[PDB]
Amino acid sequence: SKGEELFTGVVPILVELDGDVNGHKFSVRGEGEGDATNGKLTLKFICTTGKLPVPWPTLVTTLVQCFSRYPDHMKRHDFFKSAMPEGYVQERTISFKDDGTYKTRAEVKFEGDTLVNRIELKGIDFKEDGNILGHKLEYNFNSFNVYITADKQKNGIKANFKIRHNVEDGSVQLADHYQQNTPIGDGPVLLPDNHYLSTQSVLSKDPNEKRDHMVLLEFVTAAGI
Amino acid sequence: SKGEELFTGVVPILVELDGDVNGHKFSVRGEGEGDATNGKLTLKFICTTGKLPVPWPTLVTTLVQCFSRYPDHMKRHDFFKSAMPEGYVQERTISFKDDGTYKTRAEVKFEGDTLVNRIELKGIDFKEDGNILGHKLEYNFNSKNVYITADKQKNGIKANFKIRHNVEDGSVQLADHYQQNTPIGDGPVLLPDNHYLSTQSVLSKDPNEKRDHMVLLEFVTAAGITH
Numbered sequence: 001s002k003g004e005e006l007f008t009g010v011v012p013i014l015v016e017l018d019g020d021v022n023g024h025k026f027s028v029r030g031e032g033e034g035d036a037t038n039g040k041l042t043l044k045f046i047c048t049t050g051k052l053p054v055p056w057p058t059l060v061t062t063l064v065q066c067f068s069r070y071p072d073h074m075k076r077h078d079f080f081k082s083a084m085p086e087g088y089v090q091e092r093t094i095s096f097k098d099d100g101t102y103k104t105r106a107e108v109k110f111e112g113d114t115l116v117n118r119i120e121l122k123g124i125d126f127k128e129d130g131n132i133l134g135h136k137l138e139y140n141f142n143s144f145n146v147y148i149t150a151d152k153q154k155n156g157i158k159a160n161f162k163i164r165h166n167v168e169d170g171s172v173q174l175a176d177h178y179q180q181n182t183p184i185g186d187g188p189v190l191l192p193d194n195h196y197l198s199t200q201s202v203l204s205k206d207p208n209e210k211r212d213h214m215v216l217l218e219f220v221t222a223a224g225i
Numbered sequence: 226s227k228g229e230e231l232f233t234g235v236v237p238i239l240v241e242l243d244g245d246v247n248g249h250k251f252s253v254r255g256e257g258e259g260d261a262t263n264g265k266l267t268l269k270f271i272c273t274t275g276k277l278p279v280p281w282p283t284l285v286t287t288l289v290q291c292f293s294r295y296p297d298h299m300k301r302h303d304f305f306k307s308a309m310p311e312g313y314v315q316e317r318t319i320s321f322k323d324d325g326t327y328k329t330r331a332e333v334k335f336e337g338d339t340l341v342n343r344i345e346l347k348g349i350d351f352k353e354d355g356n357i358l359g360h361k362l363e364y365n366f367n368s369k370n371v372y373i374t375a376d377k378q379k380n381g382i383k384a385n386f387k388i389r390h391n392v393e394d395g396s397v398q399l400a401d402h403y404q405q406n407t408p409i410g411d412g413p414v415l416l417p418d419n420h421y422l423s424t425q426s427v428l429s430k431d432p433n434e435k436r437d438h439m440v441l442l443e444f445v446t447a448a449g450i451t452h
């Protein structure tokens with residue numbers, strides 16, 4: 001595709017999230033860069049409103065699947081780069097088992113040379129002193145295949161997948177993800193055959209950063225064809 | 226500790242493993258470097274005998290907890306660096322649920338300026354078309370925080386923990402780990418209060434390497450004590 005040409009080389013990234021979980025309002029801003037040729041992303045996120053009222057790991061999935069490395073024989077199945085530069089809308093419902101739900105809506109698009117992810121997040125029905133609002137999750141992120149399928153009727157894609165957040169006592173907090181993406185622009189996009197994305201993620205801290213924050217390194221590849 | 230002084234800066238690492246799984250002998254050699262100040266390890270491992278007869282992810286835990294980043298308030302709980310340069314013995318039993326068992330014995334010590342992990346591994350009772358010998362595990366590595374306790378009777382530490390390996394069909398292969406570490410030398414070591422290590426790992430391939438191999442990037446930190 002012509003949109004793929006925008007991801008040769010290193011691309012700067014900006015992420016903006018405005019959030020409300022059980023009435024706790026917050027904002028996150030992230031910056032960094034992406035190298036789709038190697039499937040590599042490096043970002044630093046800051047909570048600009050003070051302390052994050054939820055664990056950082058619970059926002060990883062919400063906080064740019066266009067930086068996935070598609071091998072040569074699968075280039076024609078890359079919807080995400082296909083929609084660029086005009087971009088796509090990404091919406092999810094994330095259901096935390098025995099706890100609350102996030103609903104997210106993002107626009108992912110180029111603004112000049114920068115790939116921008118602007119997100120609104122609303123969370124409801126979280127338990128005070130549950131794993132989320134009680135901050136009981138380990139600072140890490142487990143890797144599992146995310147299966148992508150075409151959504152012909154919306155000219156886009158969908159995905160449903162399960163994230164398992166490790167809990168401080170050795171238990172597991174399931175977060176069921178339901179995802180739909182659709183192009184912002186008109187003009188042709190690539191609708192894929194079934195395949196998957198695989199991401200390996202490292203969460204860390206900048207020792208000089210005083211604000212509540214997350215440093216994130218990811219390596220993402222597509223396979224399954 | 227005085228041994229922690231050896232881990233300011235970047236330290237070269239050598240890993241040597243001699244293995245026998247169900248009678249199938251193999252060897253692995255790894256090289257790279259560790260930066261305990263940032264909890265960062267980068268290594269490349271090669272199977273020097275040809276094709277690895279087990280999946281690479283099953284050897285991750287066997288293939289240097291002395292590179293963990295202990296924060297300032299927890300420095301007195303770092304047994305691993307405390308035993309250096311003379312080092313420690315690290316022994317495990319790894320039970321693969323409904324499958325075989327690895328038994329490992331390693332020495333982790335300085336030889337000159339290089340931190341060296343030399344390991345012998347014996348594996349028994351594996352199923353020939355089970356997840357291990359049948360190569361059915363995904364090329365990745367998920368982990369939970371590993372809880373460390375003192376083992377005062379051995380002047381060292383122990384840990385018991387679970388690794389869950391993703392299987393190609395969507396199932397999970399559990400590997401139950403039992404670990405004991407004891408110092409090689411006679412000098413004083415640090416015996417910790419209960420805490421945990423958190424390791425996050427990325428597995429990859431070097432596109433120019435022709436041998437069967439694993440590139441490994443890890444970030445490791447200690448936490449779980451307030452003070």
Ligand SMILES: *C(=O)O[C@H]1CCCCCc2c1nnn2*
Pocket residue numbers: 142143144164166171172367368369389397
């Ligand atoms: C903690 O044990 O996490 C496990 C949960 C069960 C196995 C499948 C989900 C998984 C795990 N690790 N990462 N994903």
